[PDB]
Design a protein around this ligand. Structure first.
Ligand code: ZR4
Ligand code: ZR4
Ligand code: ZR4
Lengths: 298, 625, 625, 318
């Protein structure tokens, strides 16, 4: 597994890595836990490691010991670190989607998750009951990104290759609503203004949108290629880490101005996780098998 | 009976996956040739210098498994019609890279999706791959009956799904395909993989695909209902569509995930097999013509050419045709000779164009059951068939039959006929030149003589068939007009086509013919009302004949003689296909032309648009006199 | 094993005769279609009005039997070249009547005799049967090795048989055939039925038939000697001719009455099966050639085209080719690195055009055998083959092999090479453009670096083969020059041909190229002594390559590497056959031409007659740069 | 051929525009305080028989600036004219170079490159490839004259022209290859169905790391009449230097310039178009290492086949 797909820091600072082999003889995936982020991604120096039967398109921490994974086989899978946190064993593997599950997001309560897929469907999951509560054929093309509301279970965002950014509220009879330019590729809810979000497009542009007066507030030509990710810093006045297929990491302020720029990666930058311990430390992983630990000038 | 494939978008280990698919009973596997998520960069650094092998090795499977079991697929991220220039350029290099790797592997088919209106650059890139090297492989365009945008759930508050009917708009994915294959110059290597959704569209949407080259039908697991004992089944409306696809011999593809885990994945395939074994039983015509489906042949010219022995044998194997002829002569003998003249009045029967002798034996069988006296004359110009007749005469018939080795138009008959019996008709009734032959024989028929058949009429019907139009297109030859193939009729068992309007009569001939002037030349205008949106490619031709009073023969589908499988319909192509919208009228013009040497047809379309006059002066096709 | 037939001029009852023939073991029956003695009239009264059936009926055998078991026969009285006009006129009508009846019957072959010098009108009447109606049938011309006049007993007192050797006179029956097939315009439907006699002529006479389309060999029962047990046997010279005929897969025919009475009749067939089983055994080169005999193919262009995975697989299946390459690399390392430097010296080896890695594996086996250190670079411009190389490098080779996905003429190498190894040669040595590819790699070769191969030379030989001439002629295509097929080389496993002179070297290339300016363009003149009377139809091409010192590869017949059969010879045809008399010299000219985009050959014959210059400026054929 | 150069040289307007473009550039590059010290290296790429060398001489006399000319030309037949001109009139001032601009290893670097490598469809004579190969020897602040060029397409109707193309059928080739290649024609009896819209543009010098002279363009032409579409007229516009320009686009045509006629891209089958409909055309500029070609398709109101796929009927030699 050379292609690093995801990097997520948990509360204490343990770094979770998601990886897959996108070439060569075998096309499988792997999950890893590094209680020492500096030893990443060396397999001989990890705390926990598992080999999944298919690739890892997306993942999310579920609490502190649970790992929800979007698989290439069309399954949504839940893994669980044991008592000692030395093994990552499987709890459920449910094949409900009819194609690659490309995106996954844990809803506010940590009791439900929203999955998105190349099969055009968005599913809501009850993690404990291990079943699908709702399936929405809302888009007209591959679901690119699904991002749950930081505080409401019935609220979440979706974007797709059909050029639609949908704002969902499952309390309405028609849950989804279209939000007001190229195809939407990434979504990130603001952690402070919980009625504001950012989205990245396939042309490199990053936009700031307001949920109430939905008509797009600010936009910046950040990248020369597709925006793969937008991750907010743990600061009270947070910074936005934007990552791209242009193999570069950017760090923006609140006016979307570039403060930091890292061209350390030699391949696609897939994820970015800000450390809970040092808020100026941001970790990015890429298809070049590099785990790059950055020191953002906050 | 059912050739099936498994569509996967996840193949962790190809030998392992192929072993499981084969175990499940599938004949083939559609899979990605590169990892579907492995986006590659061809222009910008540092992503363009990505090391390592770009995909798995060709050594993983044997050459025969690559040639027979694997159908490649284009990576979902490849978007040659993207509105972003960079994505478009990267997607063009990636598309050629995937198609070339597929050609390197010797794959028998490669899938490419039509999932939007604009596919111009996808078509240009595929046309370019076709015009490079000498690979020769099939291309399968994945195209749904219903676009995703038109089958979505009505759950977007500020974008409602329109519940009003839009006739043309419901056929949009047909236009997707039509434009794509028009841009690709009707390549015979480009075909349709029709994707079948959960809720079938209106009949007119399903019928847009009649005549289209459908090579595959994609059945997702999510469309299957669950039966009494929990096994996957399909709706009755879906089942009928399955039966149509079985007739075209399509390859069924199962896509999606296993949603019937309690019954395993081969259950979906086993249900398909059940519909295949228990399909509505076919007719004897379907049993007979098996092998001749849309195979173009030249219409026989038994006047100009001497038919071969085995050609006579195939046309003689028609019990219905000869029993109708026997019944026609039987009835005529009774109507001519009353019981008080049962011995005194001998009837002079002249079989004109006797062949190897099936009509002479029908004339004998009709005289035994009618208990009438007959004097037979078997006239035949083919000296090869006359050998058969003269051996029959010497060994069985005797003095009763006089075999004449001559053309009916030259023969100076010693006696006059009470009845003339002939089989000088073709699939378009007068295309074998029966009027000219029987006209030349009228001088020796009694002033009260009966011709059997007494009348014949040809029928035309406008048809749509991109498969047939491509078949005619392939009949181009050296040393002749490069478009002469479209200016001549073909005899073909029409299979994958759509009849756009009901057959209307074209040309009729009555025998004997009184009217002083004769003139076997004709001119006919026909107006066909079309109730569908379609593409006109030619006209199907048929015939009806009155042997004697209520005894008749027909190949006009609606009145077809039960059991008569000999004559196939004829097809008059047109050089350029014509777009026709619902409610429009197709107006065709047919002329039957002739000089002292040859007879021919000429034809033009005059509405909704004009075509050129086809076969002017018989420049590409004539029937020898 | 031996496909046989029975020739009869007496068939009293067709089914009984057929059954008897089939009981004896014959696959087919040559018989008359009309009674041989039944002379017919077409012009004069009263004999023209002869009644009854003119022959047996077609209803006597199934169409399947007429199509596979009967070979028709021209009646011995039919003489279209008679000096008597009446006989000439009747014979034309009867010849058409018979050929037409054979076509009516669907006979797979029809025999016609060439038993005199002039058959002009026989040819004209056959050509006109071929241009009338619907075809497929084969015409077997019954022509004797020795004319009856030349083998008659010397028992005429006032007309002695000539005892003088007449070189061309003894070959007169070949000219009977040649003139006939020249008049009939080399019809593919016209073949030879060669008749063998009691006395065989000189080898030159037999050799006249090399390259001719012999489809049958007629063995009369009177030519068989009787062994001590009463069994029919053949002379050792006749047995040699039979082995020659088995190589061409001719159908053997037994004509004449049974002359081994107490020894039954199937004994003639038993003897043929005996010679067939006890023939000189085919070699390993003959084992692999099966099915490829005289089948024309386009020579591969690995620089212009990306070879397919299965093409790489056939060219790797040559153990002789790679054992020679390994031996050449092994010997070279020893000459470059002495034993005292075995651990401190690293040899930079570069495989240029590595394909799927067989030369990389051979380099690895040679460095281990020699106990020397090598640093490998595998250069390959086909990105699909680079996939195979990179999956090999990751799994087995490791860092020792650096895989370079590039064209050798563009690569900016990070180091110089001690040895360059390549297999960029084709069937005519430089036809894949190895000179231009290795010249482009010379800048990164050490001033004292070795090239494997270091040298290659193409060879040419004039050939006769009317069979290959007709295969080339059939390659006419639309949308191109009607003669382009004669101005391009073909890779063909030459089988039915005559080599008319020993191969001679044509073009030679050395690497590294010490000669400044040098130029890969060539002009060569060759003079080929010919000792036979013949017809030239083209030139076979071959090659020899010196990998290193005395380690060589060759496809030149006299120096052929035994066991290496991946490469078949090339064929450079000519537009028009050229007559060559014994003692004459054939002089050919060959050019190797080029610009910055293309390379091609041009050629002309200048003696004994000139031809046009073939492929001027690569108008019909170029090799892509 | 000699007489072909003679017909294209007979254009006083074209050469006076070129003279004015070089005159303006010399002033903008060399201030009055450097009138003698700064000699300007002018490289005429594709000098022909010498009308641009004389325009470069006429522009240096009226601008009163010092120039060192290099007349590069690959046609050895035209080089004979240039070398006789050099010996008899120009002298040491002009260095005649017998080479392709893409191969020439220049001794010096150019301040200005002057070229006439344009055709009726702007880049159809392969000017982008030729000037791209000459960029290595242009100064880091060098000026290319012309600096820019754009081609223009317009849908046309002409049953007379469609019949003329139809008559260009030949033996030994595709019977429809005549409709898959452009023609240079003085368009007379025709109807322009919609206003010309720009197609492909090239800027010299070209910075962008990737280069790629390949292009793809979609054009939507609004048609206000009922008509029959038979092909597309092609024209060009070029910026020699700032406000000095040349054009064959009818509406902006250079007054007096009669040399270059418009180009015509035919279509295999005529397309019926009703008033209010939009003709949508797609053009691609394609290439390999050996040749460059165009491919084109109509996509509205109805689709046509892609014309000239892979340059099967027409290619421009590199
Ligand atoms: N003017 C003429 N005068 C005398 N005979 C004529 C003509 C023109 C055609 N014929 C013959 O009619 C037969 C008929 O078409 C037929 C009969 C039976 C079978 Cl099964 C069949 F296939 C076809 C053929 O045998 C033709 O040779
Ligand atoms: N200028 C160039 N630079 C880099 N590679 C180049 C060229 C020109 C050709 N090649 C390659 O040489 C190989 C050789 O012909 C070969 C090897 C092995 C087998 Cl079995 C076989 F059939 C053919 C092919 O793989 C070609 O792609
Ligand atoms: N890559 C190259 N390197 C060097 N010279 C090159 C090229 C390509 C073309 N040329 C020359 O440019 C001239 C130009 O087209 C021209 C100039 C003047 C008149 Cl009047 C005219 F008709 C045409 C011709 O003389 C061509 O030979």
């Amino acid at each position: 597994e050379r292609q690093l797909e995801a990097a997520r820091y948990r509360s204490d600072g343990a770094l979770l890595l998601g990886a897959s082999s996108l070439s060569g003889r075998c096309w499988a995936g792997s999950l890893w836990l590094f209680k020492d982020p500096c030893a990443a991604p060396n397999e001989g120096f990890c705390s926990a490691g598992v080999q999944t039967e298919a690739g890892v398109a997306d993942l999310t921490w579920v609490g502190e010991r649970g790992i929800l994974v979007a698989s290439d086989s069309g399954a949504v899978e839940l893994w669980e670190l044991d008592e000692n946190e030395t093994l990552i064993v499987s709890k459920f593997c449910k094949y409900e989607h009819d194609d690659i599950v490309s995106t996954v997001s844990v809803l506010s309560s940590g009791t439900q998750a929203v999955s998105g897929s190349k099969d055009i469907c968005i599913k809501v999951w009850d993690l404990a009951q291990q079943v699908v509560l709702s399936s929405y054929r809302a888009h007209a093309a591959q679901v690119t990104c699904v991002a749950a509301s930081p505080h409401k279970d019935s609220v979440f965002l979706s974007c797709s290759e059909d050029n639609r950014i949908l704002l969902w509220d499952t309390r309405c009879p028609k849950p989804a609503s279209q939000i007001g330019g190229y195809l939407p590729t990434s979504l990130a809810w603001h952690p402070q203004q919980s009625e504001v979000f950012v989205f990245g497009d396939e042309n490199g542009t990053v936009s700031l949108v307001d949920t109430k007066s939905t008509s797009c507030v600010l936009s910046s030509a950040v990248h020369s290629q597709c925006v793969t990710g937008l991750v907010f810093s743990p600061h009270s006045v947070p910074f936005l880490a934007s990552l791209s297929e242009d193999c570069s990491l950017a760090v923006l302020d609140s006016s979307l101005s570039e403060l930091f720029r890292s061209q350390a990666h030699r391949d696609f930058v897939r994820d970015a996780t800000w450390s809970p311990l040092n808020h100026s430390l941001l970790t990015t992983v890429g298809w070049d098998h590099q785990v790059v630990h950055h020191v953002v000038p906050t | 009976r059912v050739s099936s494939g498994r569509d996967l978008n996840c193949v962790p280990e190809i030998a392992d996956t192929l072993g499981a698919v084969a175990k499940q009973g599938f004949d083939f596997l559609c899979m990605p040739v590169f990892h579907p998520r492995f986006k590659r960069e061809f222009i910008q650094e540092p992503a363009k210098n990505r090391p390592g092998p770009q995909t798995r090795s060709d050594l993983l499977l044997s050459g025969r498994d690559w040639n027979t079991l694997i159908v490649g697929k284009l990576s979902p991220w490849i978007r040659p019609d993207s509105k972003v220039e960079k994505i478009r350029r990267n997607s063009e290099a990636a598309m050629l890279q995937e198609l070339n790797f597929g050609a390197y592997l010797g794959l028998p088919a490669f899938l490419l999706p039509l999932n939007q209106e604009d596919n111009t650059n996808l078509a240009r890139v595929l046309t370019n791959h076709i015009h490079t090297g000498h690979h020769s492989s099939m291309f399968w365009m994945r195209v749904p009956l219903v676009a995703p945008e038109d089958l979505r759930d009505d759950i977007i508050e500020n974008a409602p799904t329109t519940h009003t009917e839009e006739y043309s708009g419901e056929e949009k994915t047909w236009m997707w395909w039509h434009n794509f294959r028009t841009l690709c110059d009707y390549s015979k290597r480009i075909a349709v993989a029709l994707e079948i959704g959960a809720d079938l569209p209106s009949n007119h949407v399903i019928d847009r695909w009649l005549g289209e080259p459908i090579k595959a039908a994609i059945l997702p697991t999510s469309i299957f209902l669950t039966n009494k004992k929990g096994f996957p089944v399909l709706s009755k409306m879906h089942q009928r569509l399955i039966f149509r696809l079985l007739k075209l011999e399509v390859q069924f593809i199962i896509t999606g995930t296993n949603h019937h885990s309690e019954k395993e994945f081969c259950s979906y395939l086993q249900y398909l097999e059940y519909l295949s074994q228990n399909r509505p039983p076919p007719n004897a015509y379907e049993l007979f013509a098996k092998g001749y489906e849309d195979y173009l042949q030249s219409p026989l010219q038994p006047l100009m050419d001497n038919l071969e022995s085995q050609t006579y044998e195939v046309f003689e194997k028609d019990p219905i045709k000869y029993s109708q002829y026997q019944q026609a002569i039987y009835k005529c003998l009774l109507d001519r000779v009353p019981e008080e003249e049962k011995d005194t009045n001998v009837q002079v029967l002249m079989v004109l164009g006797a062949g190897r002798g099936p009509l002479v034996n029908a004339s004998l069988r009709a005289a035994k059951q009618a208990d009438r006296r007959i004097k037979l004359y078997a006239v035949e110009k083919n000296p090869n068939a006359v050998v058969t007749l003269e051996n029959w005469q010497f060994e069985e018939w005797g003095s009763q039959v006089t075999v004449v080795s001559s053309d009916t138009r030259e023969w100076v008959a010693p006696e006059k006929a009470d009845i003339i019996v002939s089989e000088l008709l073709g699939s378009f009734a007068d295309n074998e030149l029966s009027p000219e032959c029987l006209d030349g024989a009228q001088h020796f028929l009694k002033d009260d003589g009966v011709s059997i058949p007494g009348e014949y009429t040809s029928f035309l019907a406008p048809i749509s068939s991109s498969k047939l139009y491509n078949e005619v297109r392939a009949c181009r030859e050296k040393d002749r007009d490069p478009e002469a193939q479209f200016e001549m009729p073909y005899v073909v068992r029409l299979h994958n086509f759509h009849q756009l309007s009901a057959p209307q009569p074209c040309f009729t001939f009555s025998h004997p013919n009184r009217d002083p002037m004769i003139d076997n030349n004709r001119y006919c205008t026909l107006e066909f009302p079309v109730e569908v949106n379609t593409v006109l490619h030619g006209f199907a031709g048929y015939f009806e004949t009155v042997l004697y009073q209520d005894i008749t023969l027909s190949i006009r589908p609606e009145t077809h003689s039960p059991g008569m499988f000999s004559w196939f319909p004829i097809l008059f192509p047109i050089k350029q296909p014509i777009t026709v919208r619902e409610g429009q009228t197709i107006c065709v013009r047919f002329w039957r032309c002739s000089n002292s040497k040859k007879v021919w047809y000429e034809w033009a379309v005059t509405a909704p648009v004009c075509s050129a006059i086809h076969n002017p002066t018989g420049r590409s096709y004539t029937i020898g006199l």
